[PDB]
Design a protein around this ligand. Structure first.
Ligand SMILES: NC(=O)C1=CN([C@@H]2O[C@H](COP(=O)(O)OP(=O)(O)OC[C@H]3O[C@@H](n4cnc5c(N)ncnc54)[C@H](OP(=O)(O)O)[C@@H]3O)[C@@H](O)[C@H]2O)C=CC1
Ligand SMILES: COc1cc(Cc2c[nH+]c(N)nc2N)cc(OC)c1OC
Length: 186
């Protein structure tokens, strides 16, 4: 309860994506791993609440939306009503987090998962409480427009091998990448 988990991928050049798209082509392993990973709930009888940005939402194909298995939440400050296909909408991060933290929703929601974008990470990056951050390093040079902020090792712990997550380097379509785990101390 009241737990926040961050999960995002980044290129070896500290890249996240260009024009709202990942530097590397669609990865069947990265896509399945992400879904299967989030789908893997620790507590039975509960649902996971994920939050995505406007860019991320519009970037996700309708073929997958709404994403079954988990509740999709979009963060929009300009929009008044939630977008078609979305489960809920929040004006700000504090609003979405506060609502999910409230007993009213706490009964239905237990843990939260951040699925981008950088804007959401930036706001959450200033969280005082304990928070988890999953960074995937892609061993390959690719073009990117947005850069990811450097994580403080003094505050964040480098977890190369964590239970549930694979440590071995995967390879798809000639693209090698590794999953890294980061934990922030309170
Ligand atoms: N390697 C990877 O796994 C992944 C990589 N990426 C890359 O990273 C990029 C991340 O894009 P992103 O940083 O979101 O792009 P932008 O900052 O350009 O847009 C994000 C939008 O999200 C909404 N938003 C974000 N934070 C808040 C907040 N606190 N309150 C209200 N609304 C908020 C806003 O929408 P409104 O305009 O409606 O206010 C904002 O315009 C992707 O485009 C992609 O290139 C993205 C996902 C995964
Ligand atoms: C869950 O589906 C998608 C999720 C994401 C975001 C995303 C991708 N990969 C990783 N490692 N973290 C993320 N937050 C980007 C996508 O396309 C760019 C998706 O396809 C719909």
């Amino acid at each position: 309860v009241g737990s926040l988990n961050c999960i995002v991928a980044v290129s070896q050049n500290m890249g996240i994506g260009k024009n709202g798209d990942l530097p590397w082509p669609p990865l069947r392993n990265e896509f399945r791993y992400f879904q299967r990973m989030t789908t893997t709930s620790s507590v039975e009888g509960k649902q996971n609440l994920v939050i995505m940005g406007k860019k991320t939402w519009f970037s996700i194909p309708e073929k997958n939306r709404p994403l079954k298995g988990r509740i999709n939440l979009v963060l929009s400050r300009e929009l008044k009503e939630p977008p078609q296909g979305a489960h809920f909408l929040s004006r700000s991060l504090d609003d979405a987090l506060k609502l999910t933290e409230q007993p009213e929703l706490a009964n239905k929601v237990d843990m939260v998962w951040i699925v981008g974008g950088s804007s959401v990470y930036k706001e959450a990056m200033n969280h005082p409480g304990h928070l988890k951050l999953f960074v995937t390093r892609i061993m390959q040079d690719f073009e990117s427009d947005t850069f990811f902020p450097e994580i403080d090792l003094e505050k964040y712990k480098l977890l190369p091998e964590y239970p549930g997550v694979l440590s071995d380097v995967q390879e798809e379509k000639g693209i090698k990448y590794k999953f890294e785990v980061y934990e922030k101390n309170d």
